[PDB]
C-alpha cells in the first residue's frame, strides 16, 4: 500500500498538534475539582465520566499523523496503571508540558540529541530527589490512613486492607469478592499469582474492569507447544457437557487452536482462557508441576508419554475461581490437597538446601514462598448490591494505592512533590547549552500538573505555583479547601511509585519523540 | 485613511521576509568574487553593476510590510556609507544575520529585552577588541599603501594623496578637480568646508554624483529667515542677467521661498541651491562673517539696515567652484582678497588670545584651522577624458579610504578582523539565558561577511571559517587568490572605522527590529 | 516603485529565454541563403527583409527579464556594427551558443567565475590565432579585390575605392555624396573628422542612415558650457531669417539650452545640430581654434570676452556640408581660405619643432594631419537616382569593409577562420575542470556560425562542420557555390577586425551574464 | 575501519585516477565525491558541521578518523569503530551497479493509475 512520507518539521508539528489535542481532551479531568467529559455512544445514551483512562482509551483522531502522535502517547501513558494503578493523567500532562517546549527548542534550532540527554539527566536527578523526599509507610496505622484516603476516607476499608496485609504479609496476594451479607470476611485460601497476562483481549469477559474473571473453571496443564484445535477436541467436548469454564495453561498456543479459541470467545460459544506458563525451561516445568499439585490435575507432556487427545476431566486441573489480566494471573481457591501441598513444600525445601547456586536458591525460595503464602480474599458486604459494588471498587483502588505505598513509601500529592523537587534541582547543569536548555525545559514541564490543578480550581495558576515553590518540605496548596499547608497533615498524598513512573515515562516519550525525523503511514 | 495593523509574529515575519530579500539581492556583490546584478532602467537596455549601494537603492518590494522592512534597513545601513565610505554591503549582511537569528530566538520564546541587551553588550566588547587590534596609520608610507590598495595598485595616486595630506595637514579639507593637462597637479587655493548640506535633492545639478556643483556662483550671506521670494526677486533677476549660478547660505528659509526655489530648479530658471548656515547663534554669525571676508561678499542683516530686496551683485560673494553633499558643504576658490583674509585671521588670533573660556578657545581654534591655507585640490591630468574620469572616481574613493585610515587606523581586511575578535570574545557572558543566547547570536552573526565572500569564491565556507578561527592575529584567507596568510602582507586591509560603524548600525537595526511588536501601514 | 526580484536558476532562465528568442529571430537571416523575414509596420503594408541588424533593432519582448536579456544582447551586438557594419549577426549567434552552454554548465554546478575565466582565456587564444592567420590587405590589387568583394563583385566600386585610397593615403578620411551625372568624380575637398557624435538622437535628419546630414549649415564654436537658450537667440533668429541650416559645436550643452534645441528640432522650427568640442582643456581649445580657422568662423568664449548673445552669421563659420555619425562627426567643404589654412598649418609645424615629448609631438602630428590631409568625396554617378542610391549604399559598405581590412589585415569568411582557430586550439587547458569546460564551451560555440550558415544552405550541418575541421588553411565550404575549396580563391572573405570584435563582445556578454545571480525589474 | 572512515580514506587515495576522456573523468569524480556521503551524513546526524570533519579526516592517514559517540577523534580501530570489509565492499559495488543501471535508463513502461 502506498505510504505517505513526511520529513522533519511538518511531521513533528503534526505529532505535536495531535498530542495537544489528546492532552487538552484528557487533562481537564485532573484534580479533585475535575470537570466532566461526555462520551458519544451511538447505540444508546451518553455517559458522563472523569476517568482520564476512559477518555484516553476513547480518543482517536482523524488525520493519520495526528492519530499517530496521539496513539504513541496514549500507549506509553497506559503503563502508569500497569505500574501503580493510577497516574495516566499525570503522565499525559507531563508529556504535553515537556514536548511543547522541547519541539519549540527544536524549531528554534538546537541539537535535539543534546536536548534529549539534558532531559534525561534532569529526570534522573528528579528520581534521586523523589527517593530522598519519600516517606516510608509500613505501620498498620499508616497503611490504614493511606487506604482510607484512597477510598475517600473509609476507615473500615482501610482497616480491612491493613488486617489482610498483616495476615498475609505485605507481599501476599489480595483479592476482592462480593460479601454474602452485610458483614465482611477476611479468609486464607490456597492459590498463587504469577506474571502472565492474557494471550488475547478477546478473552476479556469483563472489559469495563480490563480483566478476565472465571468461576469454577477446569484447568489444563500441557507443558508443550499448542497449535491445533484437534488436540483439545475431547477436553472441549467434556467441558461443554459439564457447562463449567476451562483454563488453558500451556507452553504456548498458536495457529489453528489459537484461531478457533479466538473465534469461540468472540461468538461466546465456549468460555475458556489461555496464558503462557510462568517462567521458562526447567523452572517453568517445576512451577507447572507445583500448579498441578495445587490444582489436583496432572501435568501432561509428550515427553512424559500422554497426549492432549486423551486427557479427561479427572486429570484436568480444577479450581473454584481464577483471575487474569493483561499483565498478571492468579488462582483462587484451588482443589489440590493440603497434605500434598505440604509434601511438595518439604520436597522443594530440601531441594533448596541442596541448591548451592545462590541464584537458583533464590528462585526456589520464591517458588516455596508463593506456594506456602496461600491467598487472602476480602468479602465486601453492603445493604444493597450497588453499595457493595461501589465499596468493592474503592477497595481495589485502595489496595493498589497501598501496594504502591509499601513499594515506595509515600510523598505529598497534588504534584507538590514534583514541584518541590523541581525547585530543589534548580542548579543542575549539563555539558552544553543545548543540554542546559533541556534542563530548563524539564523543570518547566514538571511545574505543569499543579498549574493545571489550580486552573481547574479557578485561581490563577502562577500565583499558587510560585507561592508553593517559595514554600518548602511538605508545604503545598490544597485544592479541596483551596488553602495552603502540609498535604500529609491534611491527609492528601500519593504513592511515590506513581509519580516516579509518570515522570520517567513522560521523559521516555519526550526523548523518543524529539528525535523523530521521518514519519510514514498508509495513504487514505 | 484606514490603516492595516499587524502585531507580533504577523509583522516581524514580514519584516524578516523583506530584509532577507534585500540581503539576497545585495550580498551577492560582496567580496573580490562579487557576482553581477542586473538593475532595470526604463529608458533602454539594463545596466550590469556590482555596486551593492545602487542595488539597495533600487530595491523596493510590492508588499507594504516587506517594503517597510527593506526600506528601513536600507536607510539605516546607508549611514555606514555616509560615515566611512562604502559601509553598505557589510552593514546589510550583518543586519541580515543578526535580524534572522534574533527573530528565530524570539519565536523560541525568550525575553526580547534581554536579547537586545546582550546584543548591545557584545557590540561593546567587539568595539573594544577592534580598537585594540587597530593598526595605526600615522605615516606617509602607510597612507600611500592604503591609497594604492583603495585605488587598485595606483602608486602615483597614493603618492599624490600623501603629498596633499602633508601639504594641508591631516584634518585639512581636500577635493579633486579635472586635470587641465596630462600631468597631475596639487595646488592650494582659498576655501572652506562646514558640516552642512543642501536642503532639497532638486538642487543636485549632478544627481549621478550625489553632490551639487556650481561654477563661479554668487554667495548669499543673510543670517535670517527667508520668508518670501520678494527678497529673492532682485537677486534672481541680477543672477539671470549675469548668466551665472548662485549659492544661497541662509539662517532659515520659509515654505514659500523653499517651494519657489524648488520650482525654479525643476524648471531650471536659475542654478540656485540652499544650505543651512553653519552652526548656530554667535558662532554661526562669526562663521558667516569669515565666509564674507573669504568670498569678498557682504553680510546682509536688518540690524545693519541691509535687506535682500536692496541687495546687488556686489554684496554677494563669489568663488570659482563650490561642492555640496548631504551634510558636507565646501567653498572652493573664494574671490575675497588675501589682505582681508589675513586681517580676519589676525582678528580671530587676538580673540583666541583673549579667550579665557576653553570652549570658545577651541571654537576659535577650529575657525582658524578652517581658514588657514584654505583648501588643497588635486588636478587629475590624464591622456584622455575617460582616463581622467575613472582616475578621478578611484582617487576620490581612495581619498575617502585614506581619511578613514588617518582617522581610526586600519585592520586586516575582508572582514577577517570581525571573526578574529569574535573568537577572542567567546568567554563573554550575560546575566541570564536570554543575554547569553543574544551574545552567542551576535558571535555567530559576525561570521557572515567572510562566509559570504568564500561562498562567492565557491569554497566550503564552514571549512574556511573554521581554519581562520583556528588562525591568529592577521592570519586569514585571501578570497582573491584563494590562499591563506596574513592579510597585512597581501595588502587587503579594511579601514577600522568603516567596520566599526557597520557593526554598530547593524546592531542598532537589529535591536530596533527585535524590540518591535506592532506595525501600522496604509492598506494596499 | 516596488521592483520584482528574481534569483538563481529561476532568474537566469528568463535571460536564457530572451536570448533564445532573439537568436532564433536574427540568426536565420545570416548567410547567403538568408531566409526572408517580415517586419511589422503600423503604417500598413509590412516589409520583407533580411537585414539582421534591423530585425534585432525591432525586437522587444513582453516579459521584463526576457526584455532585459534581449536588450543587453542587442546593445552589445551593436558594437559589431560600430566596428565594421557586419558581424552583428555573428555576435548574436556566438552569444546564443556561449550563453546556452554556460548556463547548462552552471546547472551542472561548475563554478561560474572559473567558467568565465576559461571562456576569456580561450577567447584571447582565438584572438591571437586569428592575428597570426591574418593576411595583409594593402596595395592597389588587394584594395580592389576587397572592394569588389564588398560591393558584390563590382570592379567598378572596387576601382573607385582603390583610387580614392591612393589619392588620400590610408588614414585619409573619405566620404560619399550624390553625384550630378552618369560619370563618377573623385576630388580633394577641405574638411575634417573628429571623434564626436550627435548630442541628441533628434538630430538624425536621415533616420534610415542613422547619421546627420546638413546642406551648407552655419557653424558655431562656443568654447564654454551651453545651459540657456538665451545665449543662442540672435544666431538662431538670424539663421531662421536666412533659412540656412545650423550646426552647433560647443564645449558642453545641457539643461534648458539642450531642452529648447530638442523642442525646436521636434517642431522643425530651425534645423540645428549640436556636438561637443573635441578633447579637453588645452588640446580641446587648440582643436577648436583649428576648426574655427578651417571654417572661417570665430571661437566664442568668455575668456576672450565675446558672448554668444552678440554672435552673428558672419561670426559663425561656414561649410557646404557636415555629417554626424553615432559616435563621430565630420565637416565637409570648409569655407576657410587656403591662405589661413596654410598659416595655421605652419603655426602648428613650428609648435611641433618646439615640441619636446613624444606625446606632444604625436598630438600635434595628428592635428596637422587631420587639418592638411583634406577630404575626398565619392560623387556617385549613374543614369537614374535609384541605381545611384544602391551604388551609394554599396560604396558605403565597401568603404567600411576596406577601412577595417587595411586596419587589421583580412581573413577568409563564412566563419571558416573561427573554425580553423577552433581546430588549432584543441590542446589548451586550464588549472581546473571548470576552466577546461569553459574552454570547450568557447570552442564549440565559436564553431556555431558556420553550422548555422550550412543549416541555411539546407545541407546537413555537422557533415560540413567536420569536413571543414578536417580541412586546413583557408580551405572551406563556399555556401554560394555549395562547394568546398579555398575561400581566398573564390573571393569569400571578411575583415579580421569584425570577427575579432564579434568574438570578444560575445565572450564579454557571456561572462557578464553567467556572473548574474540576482535580477531586479519593475513590477508588470 | 568503520564510520565510513575507510571509504573516505580510499576516496582520498584515488586523487589522480583518470579515464579515456573528460566524460569518464567527471564520472570518476562523481564516484569519489559520492564516496564521502556516509561520513558527511553521519556527522550531520551528530549536529556538527559536516565538511569540517570530512576535510579533517581526509587530511589524516592510516586510520585516523572521527568518533560520533565520543564526539572526538583518534585511531578509529582502537575505539573499535570498525566494520567487515565484505559488507562495505558489497554496499559500494551494489550502489555502483544500481546507479549505472539507472543512469542507463531511457524508456519507461508501467501501468496507469
From Swiss-Prot, chains A, B, C:
Domain notes: Each subunit is composed of an apical domain that binds non-folded proteins and GroES, an intermediate domain and an equatorial domain that binds ATP and is involved in inter-ring interactions. Forms a large central channel that appears to traverse the entire length of the cylinder with no obstruction. The central channel of GroEL functions as two cavities, one in each ring, that are separated from each other by the crystallographically disordered 23-amino-acid C-terminal segments of the seven subunits. The entry and exit of polypeptide seem to be restricted to the apical end of each ring.
Function: Together with its co-chaperonin GroES, plays an essential role in assisting protein folding. The GroEL-GroES system forms a nano-cage that allows encapsulation of the non-native substrate proteins and provides a physical environment optimized to promote and accelerate protein folding, probably by preventing aggregation and by entropically destabilizing folding intermediates. Also plays a role in coupling between replication of the F plasmid and cell division of the cell.
Family matches, as HAMAP family: CH60
Residues annotated as signal peptide: none
Species the sequence originates in: Escherichia coli (strain K12)
Reactions accelerated catalytically: ATP + H2O + a folded polypeptide = ADP + phosphate + an unfolded polypeptide
Regulation: During the substrate-folding cycle, the two GroEL rings separate for effective substrate binding and chaperonin activity. Ring separation is triggered by ATP binding to the trans ring of the asymmetric GroEL:GroES complex and avoids formation of functionally impaired symmetric GroEL:GroES2 complexes. Activity of the GroEL-GroES chaperonin complex requires Mg-ATP. UMPylation of the chaperone by SelO/YdiU negatively regulates its activity, and may facilitate survival under stress conditions.
UniProtKB keywords: Acetylation, ATP-binding, Chaperone, Cytoplasm, Isomerase, Nucleotide-binding
Post-translational modification: Phosphorylated reversibly during heat shock.
EC number: 5.6.1.7
Localization in the cell: Cytoplasm
One GO biological process term: chaperone cofactor-dependent protein refolding
Name under which the protein is recorded: Chaperonin GroEL
Residues binding ATP, per UniProt: 29-32, 50, 86-90, 414, 478-480, 494
A GO MF label: identical protein binding
UniProt subunit comment: Forms a cylinder of 14 subunits composed of two heptameric rings stacked back-to-back. Interacts with the co-chaperonin GroES. Can form asymmetrical complexes, composed of one GroEL and one GroES, and symmetrical complexes, formed between one GroEL and two GroES oligomers. The asymmetrical complex is the functional unit. It was suggested that the symmetric heterooligomer may represent a transient intermediate in the chaperonin protein folding cycle.
Gene giving rise to this polypeptide: groEL
Residues that bear N6-acetyllysine: 116
Family: Belongs to the chaperonin (HSP60) family.
Major subcellular location class: cytoplasm
Residues recorded with modification N6-succinyllysine: 33, 50, 116, 276, 320, 389
Swiss-Prot record, chain D:
Subcellular location: Cytoplasm
Top-level taxon: Bacteria
Residue sites binding ATP per the record: 3, 67-69, 83
UniProt PTM: Phosphorylated reversibly during heat shock. Can be UMPylated on a tyrosine residue by SelO/YdiU, probably under stress conditions.
Effect on the protein of changing residue 49 to K: Temperature-sensitive lethal mutant. At nonpermissive temperature, the rate of general translation is reduced and a defined group of cytoplasmic proteins are translated but fail to reach native form
Subunit structure comment from the entry: Forms a cylinder of 14 subunits composed of two heptameric rings stacked back-to-back. Interacts with the co-chaperonin GroES. Can form asymmetrical complexes, composed of one GroEL and one GroES, and symmetrical complexes, formed between one GroEL and two GroES oligomers. The asymmetrical complex is the functional unit. It was suggested that the symmetric heterooligomer may represent a transient intermediate in the chaperonin protein folding cycle.
Domain comment in the entry: Each subunit is composed of an apical domain that binds non-folded proteins and GroES, an intermediate domain and an equatorial domain that binds ATP and is involved in inter-ring interactions. Forms a large central channel that appears to traverse the entire length of the cylinder with no obstruction. The central channel of GroEL functions as two cavities, one in each ring, that are separated from each other by the crystallographically disordered 23-amino-acid C-terminal segments of the seven subunits. The entry and exit of polypeptide seem to be restricted to the apical end of each ring.
Role: Together with its co-chaperonin GroES, plays an essential role in assisting protein folding. The GroEL-GroES system forms a nano-cage that allows encapsulation of the non-native substrate proteins and provides a physical environment optimized to promote and accelerate protein folding, probably by preventing aggregation and by entropically destabilizing folding intermediates.
Similarity annotation: Belongs to the chaperonin (HSP60) family.
Name the UniProt record assigns to this protein: Chaperonin GroEL
Organism whose genome encodes this protein: Escherichia coli (strain K12)
Residues of the full protein shown: 413 to 525 of 548
